[PDB]
Design a binder for this molecule. Sequence first.
Ligand SMILES: COCCc1ccc(Cl)c(CN(C(=O)[C@H]2CNCC[C@]2(O)c2ccc(OCCOc3c(Cl)cc(C)cc3Cl)nc2)C2CC2)c1
Ligand SMILES: *[C@@H]1O[C@H](CO)[C@@H](O)[C@H](O)[C@H]1NC(C)=O
Lengths: 171, 162
Amino acid sequence: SLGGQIVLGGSDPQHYEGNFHYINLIKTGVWQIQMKGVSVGSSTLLCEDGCLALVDTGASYISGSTSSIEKLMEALGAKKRLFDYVVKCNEGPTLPDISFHLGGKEYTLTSADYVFQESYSSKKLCTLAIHAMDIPPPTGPTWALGATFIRKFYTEFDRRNNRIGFALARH
Amino acid sequence: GNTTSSVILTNYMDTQYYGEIGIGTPPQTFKVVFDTGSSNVWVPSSKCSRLYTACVYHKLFDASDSSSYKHNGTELTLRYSTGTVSGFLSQDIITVGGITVTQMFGEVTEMPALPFMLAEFDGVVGMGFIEQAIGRVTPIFDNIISQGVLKEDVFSFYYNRD
Ligand SMILES: COCCc1ccc(Cl)c(CN(C(=O)[C@H]2CNCC[C@]2(O)c2ccc(OCCOc3c(Cl)cc(C)cc3Cl)nc2)C2CC2)c1
Ligand SMILES: *[C@@H]1O[C@H](CO)[C@@H](O)[C@H](O)[C@H]1NC(C)=O
């Protein structure tokens, strides 16, 4: 069991599939790209007029603004706690797909990608791998696509071209 | 150069992803997160009081065991939401995979217990841009690019699931 891997100088094909799709950075300076919408199910709940997405390898979770995630969480039936959002464990597996519109594509996570399925009991609450964090100027307000996103989407950070590239991770 | 260098990472509970770097001569090894949301290198200092929980259980850089250490001492600060992280500039040799680079990095002498005491790793290598660097210190991948030994000016991440 390999926990993960960084490649300096290239990428490892052994750990992704298909081909990289790329997105220009908005500005050199920050590993941030334009986002064109966040879906919950097949409907666009959020980020409808464009918004920003930081691609943050040193973050555990996917984060939005407090105002965005309140809305996202509304839509998931999820409950607010001091530090996290939870659902009742038995509904984790039925929770809808969440999609991130990035460049030409939808980047879709299922519930397996964002629910910590620690139980299946209705008596027990499961955490979500998505949090509210308000990031201040310059970088923020922005979403941040942390390890929750990077686990699903193998990622290349390209300095020569100031782009970021995504491939489906081979596990 | 046609070199690509990899670094095996540890997945702790799907919440922390970190791997190994060496700092100094001979190398002092640290667990670090490679953080495209930041641009500096920080480790705990051997000067961080044992009265910091966040320091008391991680590995500390000791400049006085290192023969390639070069002193700087410029104080530098990070504003974290739970309290301030601070220390001072040092320069030494750092090895990431097969790669060796002379690098300015920050030695931390105080940080908040939360969240840092729960970090399973010791430090951080920022993989972002000089613009976001505190004190405009040249980031490590900038220094790796300047060695001109890489195949392409890119770096990639794989994160497994637990
Ligand atoms: C994705 O894997 C790890 C997720 C994860 C889990 C726990 C913590 Cl506390 C973090 C913190 N963690 C983060 O949020 C980073 C996420 N992206 C932007 C900057 C960031 O917020 C950040 C936050 C703190 C920080 O402090 C520098 C001090 O570094 C140390 C750290 Cl960070 C830990 C220890 C023991 C010693 C030192 Cl000197 N540097 C960068 C930075 C990038 C580590 C990330
Ligand atoms: C530390 O290094 C920086 C390099 O940018 C320099 O500006 C600063 O004056 C240095 N302090 C010293 C050498 O004491």
